[PDB]
Amino acid sequence: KIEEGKLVIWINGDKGYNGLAEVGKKFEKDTGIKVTVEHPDKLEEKFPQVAATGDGPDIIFWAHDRFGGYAQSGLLAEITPAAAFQDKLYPFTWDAVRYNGKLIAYPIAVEALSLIYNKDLLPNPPKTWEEIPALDKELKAKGKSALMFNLQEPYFTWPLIAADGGYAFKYAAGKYDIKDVGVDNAGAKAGLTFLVDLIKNKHMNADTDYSIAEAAFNKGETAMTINGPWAWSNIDTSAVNYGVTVLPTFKGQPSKPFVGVLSAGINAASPNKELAKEFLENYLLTDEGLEAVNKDKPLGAVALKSYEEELAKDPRIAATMENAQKGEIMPNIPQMSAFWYAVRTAVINAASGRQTVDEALKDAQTNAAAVTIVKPIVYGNVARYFGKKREEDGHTHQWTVYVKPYRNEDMSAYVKKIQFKLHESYGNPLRVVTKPPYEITETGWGEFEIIIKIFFIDPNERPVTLYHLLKLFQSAMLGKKTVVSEFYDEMIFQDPTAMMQQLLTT
């Protein structure tokens, strides 16, 4: 469970979590409510896996692209900012956090990648990707390199891939078409081919990650990096005099960075929704709160009009907005995680020779379009100990073995029947339930494996089989209290029929 009377906030370790901690103390000084800020690794993965079972933080911070998928999986409370509060942020930022006409997060700040150049090593930054090899040669002469950035995260390579016609999903008729992916067009191939040729020609190194690229640029070892506003603090700390500028063009085209809106969502499972609204609207999303975060790690172009205007004069923020303007706002649709996973695969493989560009992107094109629907379920048994052992048969317990949907939905929409196979010591051990609740009540003396087979109204949709050890004895101060052994799992429907997609989606 999420502890009440406290706020737990998750934010990525590249963002100003110390400055958020300061807003945290401010909130605690005022309200007596303890705020704890954590930066767990792979939180874009950790939040959905914990929040699935109603655990994790009260507040989750990530780029808005993940939030449609979070809200789709029921992981987010719809936020209730008054009209007055909405006027204080840019309408553009609210759009990034609107899924199915519902606001599902508080926008914080607009992030785009820029080219970051050591002004000493390189007074005049390259206007093109193409001139970079010749620059890395002139610089390899002096024991330097031209360019190092994170090749492990497709976010950083995507601007190049998008430059000559790569796209995620083509927007049309007021929605993104998840069948029309632009990952394996001539544009996308030319961009990823150029990245691969930079590696093959030792202008760059395929294992270069965030830490290596950053550490390299901040020690003055590499003339350029590609990174977002958050990276500026560590460069400020370093001796490096740096410019933030427009990304190089590729084949004469602007590099097109995916534009993220750093967004703050409230956990659906939070007992502290009012406290999270208070903290976000009235402490964080103020000039004082954003300054406290921004001075730790720059946010970019903040959603809050008042503070955006104060910061707008900074040329690093103008370059960010220039790159953003050449880029595309990321969709927030659930399919973005599939797209990102697919392109991470293609870029890493291609970059490390494991695949060619054409294989990698052909694979990524198919993976980015792959519809995966998730039905979270709970299954197991409740078992109530009788007053005393019935001697007739020797049974000690009444038990119910069950499968139910995790979230209160109508499982019968797509489930035709659930079969529970009991031990041979039961007559008609193959018990079938065609209608909810999907459960069998029985009496017995023993624990045995029950096999549970779930059937779908589309019979082509392969049945799911579960294994449950019926439990009667937990063994623990609980006495006549009903013993519980239930488990959360997720049923996964990969590219199901439109019939099945319809019943699977309420």
């Binding site: 896996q49 079972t53 998730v374 039905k375 709970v378 779930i454 779908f456 949709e461 392969r462 049945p463 799911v464 579960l466 052994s485 239930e486 488990f487 959360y488 799992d489 997720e490 049923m491 996964i492 429907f493 990969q494 199901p496």
Partner: peptide, 11 residues
Amino acid sequence: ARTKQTARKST
């Protein structure tokens, strides 16, 4: 359909 690659979680 299949279950998740990741283990079931005790509630």
